Amino acid sequence: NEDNARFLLLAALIVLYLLGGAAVFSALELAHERQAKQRWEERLAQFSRGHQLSRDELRGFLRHYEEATRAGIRVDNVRPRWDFTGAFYFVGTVVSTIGFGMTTPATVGGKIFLIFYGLVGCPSTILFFNLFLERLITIIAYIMKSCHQAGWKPSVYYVMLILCTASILISCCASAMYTPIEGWSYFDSLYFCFVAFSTIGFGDLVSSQNAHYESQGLYRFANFVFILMGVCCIYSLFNVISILIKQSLNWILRKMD
Amino acid sequence: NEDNARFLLLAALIVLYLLGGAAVFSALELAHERQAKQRWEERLAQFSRGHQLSRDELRGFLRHYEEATRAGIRVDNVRPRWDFTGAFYFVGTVVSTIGFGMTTPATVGGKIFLIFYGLVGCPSTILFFNLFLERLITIIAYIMKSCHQAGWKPSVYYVMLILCTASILISCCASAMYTPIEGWSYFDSLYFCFVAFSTIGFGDLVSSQNAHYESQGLYRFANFVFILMGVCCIYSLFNVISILIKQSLNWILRKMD
Ligand SMILES: CCCCC/C=C\C/C=C\CCCCCCCC(=O)O
Ligand SMILES: CCCCC/C=C\C/C=C\CCCCCCCC(=O)O
Ligand SMILES: CCCCCCCCCCCC
Ligand SMILES: CCCCCCCCCCCC
Ligand SMILES: CCCCCCCCCC
Ligand SMILES: CCCCCCCCCC
Ligand SMILES: CCCCCCCCCC
Ligand SMILES: CCCCCCCCCC
Ligand SMILES: CCCCCCCC
Ligand SMILES: CCCCCCCC
Ligand SMILES: CCCCCCCC
Ligand SMILES: CCCCCCCC
Ligand SMILES: CCCCCCCC
Ligand SMILES: CCCCCCCC
Ligand SMILES: CCCCCCCC
Ligand SMILES: CCCCCCCC
Ligand SMILES: CCCCCC
Ligand SMILES: CCCCCC
Ligand SMILES: [K+]
Ligand SMILES: [K+]
Ligand SMILES: [K+]
Ligand SMILES: [K+]
């Protein structure tokens, strides 16, 4: 009966969390949204009036441009899709369950292969992350024992603090490279790092997509390394926080009578 | 030395997997990509000649349209963002790490809150999925014991088969709708189900945004239920497959001496 009670309590807490978050986000974003929509409508009206065009023609043109944009066409000089390097980027985003969406299959045959490829490849990456976490815990224990100088395993709190510090350092080091090379601010770089590392992958900000990219040989390698390390660290941090949340739920159940 | 060897072997296998997958995907998709680009170029040239507009003016108009699209505007009628139910959909996509990208924060203050909200909310959903898997295993053992009529826990193989059957049934039941209600083909519905359930979330196909949606009260509830069950089942299946892959890695290590 304890497991059922814990399950029900967690479900209720998540429901309340979702409701509160929805209210807060709506209150934060509604005015901005409405203002942006009004600005777009004014711009569209001005363009239509200036060049004496018709709305239906503009709707057809925009539908064609929407089709072209899913094909892959952009307005500022993007790198080609479905070359070997682009395919490598795509499969890397697939196996990590990031799913930026900048590149998607469009043919029958590439979607069946997409399904089978993901079905065979995502568990391997999950196992790799688990093995990385185990190795990191072992090396942390060994380092601590050597510094003090088996039974020297660190507690969960210290592992959480170390993972937080590592994540902060990795994010600030990746941002220190993203900000100059891209046209991004430091806060935007940190936001992109958080969105990519947590495997949410909104897709609004994607790096390394500007055709000629200066040196472009070391830059792609550095991007790959940074994303890999960040994803590993954030995965481990989330697992530790989940363990702590389970302990807190147990305490909440015990206190209530 | 066994753990290091297993880590190295898994890394090498994943690297080879990525290379082969990139080569296959590129060979599958390059011709379609080139044909789509040529079609878009021809359409743009025909519009330009049709109405004698200069290229730069069209580039500016398309940049404005991209900015508008980043705020939610589409050529078809779509539901509003951030009212109260769009926010609920957004937070649901956030906590499950799906990240469709149809709705993203655009203000300073909504991005800090996004970071903290995700940091506190993703581990809770991970814990919920783990508890669901434990409860499912327990109930499966109970049903098996009752049918035969503690030590009656099923093997990993049978759990994998049952999870596969449940995933297929849930996908087919969800695809029974989504097909007439949204103009989608059955194969497209199955592809969308796989992409959403695995928490990849490309965002090319997103369900339940067409402004007026007939009943629209029961339909949203059914969509919520279907996505929740599918994500749970696919998460459990991936964990079981990861366990099997680890066993296979141990076997190949033993064979290589
Ligand atoms: C040592 C290998 C271990 C296995 C790696 C596992 C998962 C892959 C992780 C992250 C994907 C990173 C995105 C690819 C970047 C390509 C670089 C570029 O072209 O810009
Ligand atoms: C009751 C158990 C609580 C646990 C829920 C946990 C995570 C939420 C997961 C998936 C929700 C996906 C978003 C679907 C919302 C659609 C609603 C609409 O169409 O408007
Ligand atoms: C620019 C590199 C793209 C091809 C990917 C392979 C090289 C980097 C990773 C190799 C690690 C062994
Ligand atoms: C139409 C759905 C409105 C948004 C909130 C719905 C909450 C109902 C599902 C969970 C109740 C336990
Ligand atoms: C230790 C690596 C971090 C330093 C890289 C800074 C790059 C700044 C110039 C783009
Ligand atoms: C122009 C600088 C871009 C390359 C960054 C070098 C980092 C490589 C070592 C990790
Ligand atoms: C649970 C089985 C019912 C789901 C399919 C309903 C079909 C809906 C479209 C008419
Ligand atoms: C018209 C279809 C509306 C959805 C019916 C399904 C509701 C029960 C699902 C459990
Ligand atoms: C007897 C407890 C039932 C729990 C139902 C939970 C629904 C998600
Ligand atoms: C196009 C050059 C990259 C080829 C990959 C090399 C892997 C060893
Ligand atoms: C010998 C232990 C290997 C751990 C290395 C971790 C690399 C970041
Ligand atoms: C084009 C230079 C490739 C740099 C990556 C090689 C690292 C082993
Ligand atoms: C000597 C142990 C192997 C470390 C190589 C790094 C693996 C990514
Ligand atoms: C628990 C009831 C919540 C109702 C949400 C608002 C309905 C429009
Ligand atoms: C003993 C109650 C378990 C509930 C499982 C519900 C699965 C939908
Ligand atoms: C508008 C009808 C609401 C449907 C939700 C049912 C509550 C369990
Ligand atoms: C936090 C309770 C919900 C209030 C907004 C509908
Ligand atoms: C799988 C070997 C490499 C394929 C050609 C780049
Ligand atoms: K995702
Ligand atoms: K995504
Ligand atoms: K994900
Ligand atoms: K996405």
Map B154-175 to HEC letters.
CCHHHHHHHHHHHHHHHHHHHH
Residue B79 backbone dihedrals phi, psi, to 5 degrees: -65, 150
Is ligand 12 within 6 A of the CB of residue A221?
Answer: yes
Element (H, E) at B228: helix B218-255
Method: cryo-EM
Checking phi first, is residue B72 left (phi over 0); if not, alpha (psi -120 to 50) or beta?
left
- Alpha-carbon distance of B139 to B125, in angstroms, equals 21
User: Is the CB of A28 less than 8 angstroms away from the CB of B107?
Assistant: yes
Instruction: For residue A211, give Cα distances in angstroms to A78, A79, A203, A216.
Output: 5, 4, 18, 9
Cβ B94 vs Cβ B111: under 8 Å: no
Tell me A80's DSSP state.
P
Same domain, A61 and A134: no
Same domain, A247 and A169: yes
Contacts B30 to A, Cβ<8 Å: 82-83
Q: Determine the distance in angstroms separating the CA of A148 from the nearest CA of chain B, rounded to an integer.
A: 24
Domain stop point among B11, B36, B69: B69
- Alpha-carbon distance of B199 to A98, in angstroms, equals 8
Give residue A111's identity as a one-letter amino acid code: K
Residue nearest to atom 1 of ligand 16 (CA): B217
Cβ A131 vs Cβ B10: under 8 Å: yes
Judging by beta carbons within 10 Å of its beta carbon (0-12, 13-18, 19+), is residue B23 exposed, middle or buried? middle
- Alpha-carbon distance of A134 to A236, in angstroms, equals 10
Closest among B156, B126, B161 to B246, alpha carbons compared: B156
Domain stop point among A71, A89, A104: A71
Contacts A88 to B, Cβ<8 Å: 18-19, 22
**Can you give the C-alpha Rg of chain B in angstroms?**
24
B25 among annotated binding-site residues: no
Most B CBs within 10 Å: which of A202, A220, A250, as the mutation test of the B interface? A202
- Ligand 7, closest atom to CA B173? 4
Closest among A144, A147, A83, A252 to B34, alpha carbons compared: A83
Closest among B135, B114, B115, B123 to B96, alpha carbons compared: B123
Same domain, A62 and A141: no
Centre of ligand 20 to C-alpha B95, Å, is 12
Give residue A106's identity as a one-letter amino acid code: A
Is ligand 5 within 6 A of the CB of residue A173?
Answer: yes
- Alpha-carbon distance of B130 to B136, in angstroms, equals 10
Tell me A153's DSSP state.
P
Centre of ligand 9 to C-alpha A139, Å, is 42
SS3 A211: coil
B97 among annotated binding-site residues: yes
Total number of residues shown for chain B: 257
Q: Determine the distance in angstroms separating the CA of B242 from the nearest CA of chain A, rounded to an integer.
A: 5
Q: What's the N-to-C CA distance of chain B in angstroms? A: 13
Most A CBs within 10 Å: which of B19, B82, B142, as the mutation test of the A interface? B82
Domain stop point among A39, A55, A71: A71
Cβ A60 vs Cβ A53: under 8 Å: no
- Alpha-carbon distance of A228 to A176, in angstroms, equals 17
> HSE-up of B16 (CA within 13 Å, CB side)?
6
Cβ B246 vs Cβ A127: under 8 Å: yes
- Alpha-carbon distance of A184 to A177, in angstroms, equals 10
Cβ B3 vs Cβ A130: under 8 Å: no
- Alpha-carbon distance of A198 to A183, in angstroms, equals 23
Residue B199 backbone dihedrals phi, psi, to 5 degrees: 60, 30
Is ligand 4 within 6 A of the CB of residue A15?
Answer: yes
- Alpha-carbon distance of A154 to A140, in angstroms, equals 8
Cβ B39 vs Cβ B31: under 8 Å: no
Instruction: For residue B217, give Cα distances in angstroms to A41, B86, B193, B224.
Output: 30, 14, 21, 11
User: Is the CB of B81 less than 8 angstroms away from the CB of A124?
Assistant: no
Q: What angle do CA B208, B214, B216 make, to 5 degrees?
A: 50
- Alpha-carbon distance of A138 to A150, in angstroms, equals 9
Test site for ligand 2: of B78, B82, B89, B231, most ligand atoms within 8 A of the Cβ: B89
Instruction: For residue A111, give Cα distances in angstroms to A65, A87, B61, B191.
Output: 24, 14, 34, 7
The verdict on residue A129 lying in a domain is: yes
Is ligand 8 within 6 A of the CB of residue B249?
Answer: no
Element (H, E) at B40: helix B2-51
For chain A, the maximum distance between any two Cα atoms, rounded to a whole number of angstroms, is: 82
- Alpha-carbon distance of B61 to B65, in angstroms, equals 6
Same domain, B138 and B55: no
**Can you give the C-alpha Rg of chain A in angstroms?**
24
Domain range for B59: 1-69
Is ligand 11 within 6 A of the CB of residue A70?
Answer: no
Same domain, B93 and B194: yes
Same domain, A131 and A241: yes
Q: Which distant-in-sequence residues (6+ apart) come within 8 Å of A118 by Cβ?
A: A94, A95, B194, B198, B200
Q: Which distant-in-sequence residues (6+ apart) come within 8 Å of A208 by Cβ?
A: A79, A89, A219, A220, A223
Tell me which long-range contacts B133-138 makes (C-beta under 8 A, separation of at least 24).
B133/B232, B133/B235, B133/B236, B133/B239, B134/A3, B135/A3, B135/A7, B136/B236, B138/A3
List, chain by chain if needed, residues with CB within 6 Å of any ligand 7 atom: B 173, 176-177
Helices (H), A51-154: 55-71, 84-95, 110-148
Instruction: For residue A89, give Cα distances in angstroms to A41, A208, A227, B8, B32.
Output: 37, 10, 12, 22, 18
A98: tokens are: 């990031």
CATH code for position A158: 1.10.287.70
Residue nearest to atom 6 of ligand 11 (CA): A136
Closest among B108, B117, B118, B90 to A32, alpha carbons compared: B108
Q: Determine the distance in angstroms separating the CA of A55 from the nearest CA of chain B, rounded to an integer.
A: 11
User: Is the CB of A11 less than 8 angstroms away from the CB of B123?
Assistant: no
Give residue A121's identity as a one-letter amino acid code: G
Task: Count structural domains, chain A.
Answer: 2
> HSE-up of B160 (CA within 13 Å, CB side)?
11
The verdict on residue A92 lying in a domain is: no
Judging by beta carbons within 10 Å of its beta carbon (0-12, 13-18, 19+), is residue A67 exposed, middle or buried? middle
CB-based burial, B241-252: b 16+ in 10 Å, e otherwise: bbeebbeebeee
Residue with tokens 């083909």: B185
Same domain, B65 and B82: no
- Alpha-carbon distance of A100 to A196, in angstroms, equals 8
Centre of ligand 5 to C-alpha A178, Å, is 9
Judging by beta carbons within 10 Å of its beta carbon (0-12, 13-18, 19+), is residue B58 exposed, middle or buried? middle
Cβ A6 vs Cβ A253: under 8 Å: yes
Same domain, B107 and B227: yes
Closest among A197, A199, A220 to A208, alpha carbons compared: A220
